[PDB]
Structure formats: C-alpha cells, structure tokens
Write an enzyme that holds these catalytic residues in place. Structure first.
Site, short mmCIF file in Angstrom:
data_model
loop_
_atom_site.label_atom_id
_atom_site.label_comp_id
_atom_site.label_asym_id
_atom_site.label_seq_id
_atom_site.Cartn_x
_atom_site.Cartn_y
_atom_site.Cartn_z
NE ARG A 1 -2.89 1.25 3.51
CZ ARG A 1 -3.83 1.47 4.42
NH1 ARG A 1 -5.10 1.60 4.06
NH2 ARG A 1 -3.51 1.60 5.70
CD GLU B 1 -8.80 5.52 2.22
OE1 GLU B 1 -7.70 5.56 1.63
OE2 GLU B 1 -8.92 5.17 3.42
CG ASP C 1 -8.87 7.62 5.96
OD1 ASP C 1 -8.77 8.76 6.45
OD2 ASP C 1 -7.87 6.95 5.61
CG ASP D 1 -5.33 3.05 9.51
OD1 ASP D 1 -6.20 3.89 9.78
OD2 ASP D 1 -5.31 2.44 8.43
C1 LIG Z 1 -5.74 -1.15 8.06
C2 LIG Z 1 -6.23 -0.87 9.40
C3 LIG Z 1 -5.72 -1.25 10.70
C4 LIG Z 1 -4.54 -2.06 10.98
C5 LIG Z 1 -3.28 -1.70 10.48
C6 LIG Z 1 -2.18 -2.50 10.71
C7 LIG Z 1 -2.31 -3.68 11.47
F1 LIG Z 1 -1.22 -4.44 11.72
C8 LIG Z 1 -3.56 -4.06 11.99
C9 LIG Z 1 -4.66 -3.25 11.73
N1 LIG Z 1 -6.53 -0.76 11.67
N2 LIG Z 1 -7.52 -0.10 11.08
C10 LIG Z 1 -7.40 -0.12 9.67
N3 LIG Z 1 -8.30 0.44 8.80
MG LIG Z 2 -7.85 5.16 5.05
#
Ligand SMILES: Cc1c(-c2ccc(F)cc2)n[nH]c1N
Ligand SMILES: [Mg+2]
Length: 713
Positions: A325, A420, A448, A619
């Site tokens: 990503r 998003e 988001d 995140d």
């Molecule tokens: C992609 C994501 C995460 C996430 C990111 C990294 C990880 F290792 C575990 C979850 N939390 N919320 C979102 N939308």
């Molecule tokens: Mg996002």
C-alpha cells in the site's frame, strides 16, 4: 547538505545508496538510466499531481461557501455538485479487462491481513499466516469461553483442549460433510483408490462430496495429514497419534490447519510512521527482504508439498500473496528534493521504489532472492485516498510511466482502489472505469471515509456522534454501493471486493459472531489485524459461499445518489451535556492515545486501550475522524476550545497510565505544553477544520520530525 545530484533531483544519500547497492542489483536496470528515469517521471508528473491537489481545495472552497449561504434542498445540492464538476456523469455499463492476476485474487474468497511494513517481525508473521492452526486460534482466544473449568493458566488445560477439539470437529462436519456420521466419532483416515475414507466405530464412510478431498501426506494407508478443500479454501487435518494432543484424540488428530490470510497488504501508509528518508529506507528495506524472500529474524515459510488424490506430488503456496500500500497523492517527503529545495511528492516516489523492489518477487534466483510473490507477474499496489476518476487516471499514468523506467510490460503494476473519499464514492463506477485494465481490488472502511464525510460538509452544521455514524443512511448506502459497482463491473471471478478492518484484537468471540456479515454482504475479502484473527475469520468463508452471494446480488442497484449524499447532520437538541462530555472525552483520548505513540515512538499501529480499556488496533484514520468531529463541534458551538483543552488535560494522565507497562514512554501530564505529543493532539483538533480534506499527515509528520530533532541534541 548530504545529497546526490541527478538532473534536477537532490537524492538523500541513504536512499541513493540503498537503491544502488540493494534494490537495483539483479533487476538488470542500469543505475544511471534508472535515476534519469526518476528525474524524468518526477519532472513530468509533478504538475498534474499538483493540479489535482489544487482541484480538491477549489471544490471544497466552493462547497464551504455553498453551505454558509444556507433543511437542505437536495435537488439544488445535487445540481450544484454537478455544476462544479464534483458529481460527474455515470459511464455506460462495462467489464474490467485486467489480466495476469493471481488466483488468490480472481477466484479465492478469504481473509486479508494488513501490517506495518516497517515492522519486520510483524511483516514476517503476516507472510507466514497463509496457514494457521485453528487449535491455537481457539485455545488462545475467548472464542472458547473460560467458564466451566476451561480457564487458561500457565499450563495446558485439558478441559479447554477438549472444547477446542469439539469446536474443530463440528467445523469439519459443517464444512466437509461426511455422507453419514460425524467427524466427532472418527477413529481414523485412509486413502483408498484416490478417495478419502473415514473410519467410524460401526462403519466406514467417504465425503458427502468426494471432490472436497484434495490431497494428503505420508502413506495412503496411514496418512500423516489429510488435505481438504471447501469454497476454494484448504483445510489440513494433522494426524499424529503419538503427539500429546493426538494421544487423547479419538482419531489421533493433532491439529486442524486452515488456509487463512490468502493475501496480505504490506503498508507504507496509514499504519506506519515514516516522516523522512531514514524512515523510508527502513520501509523499502523490509519490502526488499520480503520480495527477495530472504528476510528473517525464523524464516519465510516455503511452499507446502502434498500428494494429490491421484498419486503425484504438488505444491501449494506457503506464503500470503503480498500487496503493497503506497502513500496517496498528498504528501511530499525529503527523501528527494529538487535544486530549489522543494520536497518531491511521496506517492510518486513510492510507485518507483516499491515498484522497483517488487521485481525481485517475480522470480527466484541468486540475485533476486529465493522466494516468489506473484506467480503471474503482477505487482499489486493499493492506492489510498484518491478523490474521483481523474486522480485514478493519474495513478494509472504514473504506474504506466514507472513501468517504462523499470522495463516492465504495460499493466504489470495492478491497482487496488480504496474507496474512502466521498468524491470517489459518488463517482465509483467512473473511478473503476479509469482503471479498467489495472484494477484488482476495491474496498470500504469506516474511519477515513467518515473523516472525509465530516470534512466535506463541515459548514453544513453539527454532525452526529462517532458511534452514531456507523448506522447513518449515507454509510449504509456507501457500503452497498461499493459492492454493487464492483459486481456490475464484473469483479466476481476477476477482482476483490473488500470490506473494512476488525479493530478489537482481544474480542475474538465477537469477531466470529458478527464479522460474518461481510462475506454475507458479498465481500470476497475483508481485513483482519492479526494472523490469529485471519484464521478465525476464515471460518466465515467456509460457512458463507461468497461466489454464490455475489451471483444473487447481480444487477441490483441498492443505493441511490440521494442516499449517498445524505449529510449526517444532528437533529435539534440531540444531546444532554453529559452526552456531549462523553463524546468529547472519547475523541480526545483516541487522539491522545494514538498520537503519543506516533510522535514519541514512530509507531502507527498497536494495541491501544480506548477510554474503557478495550484494546483497539486502528490506523491513522482514527485521528482524522476524531479530529474532524471535534473541529465540527467547535465550529458550530456544540463545544468550546476550553472544553477541548480541559478534556485533553483530563485524558492525558489516563493515557499515561495506560502506557505504564512501557519503558520508553514519557508522560504528557502534567507539563502538557512541553509534550510535543500533547501539542500535536491539540493542534490536530484546533487546526483540524483548516487541513486539506481534514488530513492529519501535515501536522503529524511535522511534529514527529520535531520530536526526532529534539532527540538529536
Ligand atoms: C488497516 C487498518 C488497521 C490495521 C493496520 C495494521 C495492522 F497491523 C492491523 C490493523 N486498523 N484499522 C485499519 N483500517
Ligand atoms: Mg484510510
């Protein structure tokens, strides 16, 4: 300074050295040509990158004024969006033509992991999480209640183990039915005439459908394991009567292994903290190790070998197929600056470097490393935060130009469109069309998209609380509209339709209970935050036939444009002061909780205790939604900046206590105004309304390199 001049580029030495000494060797791309390629691509695409960012501001400036000049008239609202070029016309029906795509993506429905690329051990585990033990997943989580003497302790609990075993046996019955009797009463397994044969106490039976038998290991008269397949996903029964667990087991079964995380997204965006050239190289370095297939801390698993029911040897992938990503269109990074000193656009850099590195993953050799990612020759890039069809087209043109520098065939670099942002949602069909020969993925999320929702309609009035947002008409239409657009563009059998992340890493029982809704909605994939979660979420794809669900949804239009455009304004006097107070504290500690670890420790993904000590792994989007919500309430007089400061001050010690188990942590309280983390949190809110599309990166990136600067003296 410490840069290498190439054309108009001043490349940070660490980056330049990494590309030349680590990334390039083995790709048969000549170094000087590569760097001229970079100079060229950057000079050529920067103006358009800039024009698109300017288009965003111009649109938002217009919408802002529109709301200020006025119970919304939706016909006028809509006509205005069409007039300014925000709502574009919908293209005629079409089918994507993307080719050279791995079977993990076109055909298989199942879990998808996301992990910070900066964390090599997490990244390692994610890649190996293609196969995971169901026993470990059940025993180690709350999916099996601890109630009736089934509690966990420092040593193995045999009563808990039996419940795990019974749970797995029932899973087998539901997924790979025997023509009579249950797996619970199985006494042994034999391969007889390329058929699986299961011994019961009073008889013997085969599978209700023998085609679900996909292989085995060991002698056919006494297999060491039996491989099964259901809905394109593999189940392995390990049979070992002399292991401890096997000895107690009626059929000598030691474990049940599920094909789990079919694909993984290695993340350079919202789950990592990378604010400069040093951070970016760490990132690219792990991605190289992964694509070479030699990164280790414990190695990357090799492919698994089996005996076909016929009799030959075959090989199944042992690693999770990796996507990467990239960051999106907004940010610049000092990894490259030009002569005048302007930071180069980070997304452009990511396409070049993450693309270059990914060449190694296309073959196995001395110079490329031993392990293969894509078996068809694709590089899979998920691109976040695109606003509308023109930003998609620009991404494709970037990938196209990157392919030329790297010497790759056209359309090698596939794109995953994250839906998003609002301007993508309402133009989704057009966004997909703009990538019709590169697209292999679309997905939805909550945090988001809702951040954008609040920012876009910032001037319209106070918005509903964050919890309330989850069930608003716009977001329900948005979820259904995503799936519909994808299916109408021919995604089933061709590309993934994804849904959002489960964030409560400790609430596995809840996940097993509710996350089943996503495959049921026709998502061929959805996001899980850990290998254990991938394993448990895989149960859902066994219970739900996604291919069949997608088929039944075909041609349905379940969302109107009016529904998509319903702004989540709060009603009159919706809230008591204690409710307002609750919401403010909630958002203030979600911002503080996440921000202290971002700024002070360069961590963007981790188990962060919420205000009620529930562990969430969100995140950076959590910052966007929370800050936009507070800024919205500030702007309309729901709350005051005093309330905000007073809340942040009230929540800071609590965040401090929730990090007690940490050595590196430095408290924020009670000298708030000397904590860069605390000042960042406060800026994110009080300056929130002024940020481009409510993005948090500008403030965050700045504060992190401020902290790092102070560390350097
Ligand atoms: C992609 C994501 C995460 C996430 C990111 C990294 C990880 F290792 C575990 C979850 N939390 N919320 C979102 N939308
Ligand atoms: Mg996002």
């Amino acid at each position: 300074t410490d840069r290498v001049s190439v054309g108009n580029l001043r490349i940070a030495r660490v980056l330049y050295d990494f590309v030349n000494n680590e990334a390039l060797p083995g790709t048969d791309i000549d170094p000087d040509s590569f760097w001229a390629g970079v100079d060229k691509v950057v000079a050529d695409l920067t103006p358009q990158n800039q024009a698109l960012l300017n288009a965003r501001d111009e649109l938002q400036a217009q919408i802002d004024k529109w709301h200020r000049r006025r119970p919304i008239d939706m016909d006028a609202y809509r006509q205005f969006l069409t007039e300014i070029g925000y709502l574009l016309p919908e293209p005629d029906d079409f089918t994507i033509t993307t080719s050279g795509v791995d079977a993990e993506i076109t055909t298989t429905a199942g879990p998808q992991l996301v992990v910070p690329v900066l964390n090599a051990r997490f990244a390692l585990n994610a890649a190996n999480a293609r196969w995971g033990s169901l026993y470990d997943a059940l025993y180690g989580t709350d999916v099996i209640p601890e109630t009736d003497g089934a509690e966990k302790g420092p040593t193995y609990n045999k009563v808990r183990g039996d419940k795990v075993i019974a749970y797995a046996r029932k899973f087998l019955d539901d997924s790979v039915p025997l023509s009579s009797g249950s797996f619970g009463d199985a006494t042994g397994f034999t391969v007889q005439d390329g058929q699986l044969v299961v011994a019961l106490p009073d008889k013997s039976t085969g599978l209700a459908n023998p085609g679900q038998f996909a292989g085995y290991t060991g002698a056919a008269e006494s297999p060491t394991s039996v491989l099964l397949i259901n809905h394109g996903l593999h189940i392995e029964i390990l049979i070992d009567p002399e292991s401890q667990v096997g000895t107690t087991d009626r059929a000598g079964v030691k474990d049940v292994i599920l094909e789990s995380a079919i694909t993984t997204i290695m993340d350079f965006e919202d789950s990592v903290a990378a604010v400069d050239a040093a951070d970016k190289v760490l990132g690219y370095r792990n991605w190289l190790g992964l694509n070479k297939g030699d990164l280790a801390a414990r190695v990357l698993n090799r492919d698994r070998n089996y005996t076909a029911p016929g009799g030959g040897q075959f090989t199944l992938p042992g690693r999770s197929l990796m996507f990467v990503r990239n960051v999106g269109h907004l940010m610049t990074n000092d990894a490259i600056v030009d002569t005048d000193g302007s930071e180069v656009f980070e997304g452009i850099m990511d396409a070049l470097f993450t693309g270059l590195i990914a060449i190694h993953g296309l073959k196995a050799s001395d110079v490329n490393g031993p392990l293969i990612n894509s078996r068809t020759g694709s590089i899979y890039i998920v691109k976040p935060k695109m606003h509308g069809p023109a930003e998609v087209a620009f991404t494709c043109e970037l990938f196209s130009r990157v392919e030329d520098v790297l010497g790759l065939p056209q359309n090698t670099m596939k794109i995953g469109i994250m839906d998003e942002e609002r301007r993508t949602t309402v133009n989704l069909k057009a966004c997909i069309k703009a990538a019709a020969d590169r697209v292999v993925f679309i997905n939805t999320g909550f945090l988001d998209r809702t951040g954008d929702e609040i920012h876009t309609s910032m001037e319209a009035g106070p918005m509903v609380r964050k919890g309330t947002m989850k069930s608003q008409p716009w977001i329900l239409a948005y979820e259904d509209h995503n799936v519909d657009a994808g299916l109408a563009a021919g995604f089933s059998g061709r590309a993934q339709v994804g849904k959002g992340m489960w964030t409560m890493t400790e609430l596995m029982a809840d996940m097993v209970e509710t996350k089943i809704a996503q495959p049921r909605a026709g998502a061929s994939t959805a996001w899980v935050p850990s290998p254990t979660a991938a394993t448990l979420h895989a149960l859902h794809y066994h219970q739900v036939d996604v291919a069949a669900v997608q088929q039944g949804l075909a041609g349905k239009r379940r969302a109107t444009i009016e529904q998509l455009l319903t702004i989540p304004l709060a009603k009159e006097l919706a809230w008591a002061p204690d409710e307002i107070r609750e919401e403010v504290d909630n958002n203030c500690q979600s911002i503080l909780g996440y921000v202290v670890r971002w700024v002070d420790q360069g961590v963007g993904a981790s188990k962060v205790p919420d205000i009620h000590d529930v562990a969430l792994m969100e995140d950076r989007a959590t910052l966007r939604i929370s800050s936009q919500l507070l800024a919205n309430w500030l702007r309309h007089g729901v709350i005051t900046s005093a309330d905000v400061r007073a809340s942040l001050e009230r929540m800071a010690p609590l965040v401090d206590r929730q990090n007690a188990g940490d050595v590196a942590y430095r408290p924020m309280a009670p000298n708030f105004d000397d904590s860069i983390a605390f000042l960042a949190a406060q800026e994110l809110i009080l300056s929130g309304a002024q940020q481009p599309n409510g993005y948090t990166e500008p403030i965050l990136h700045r504060r992190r390199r401020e902290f790092k600067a102070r560390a350097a003296e």
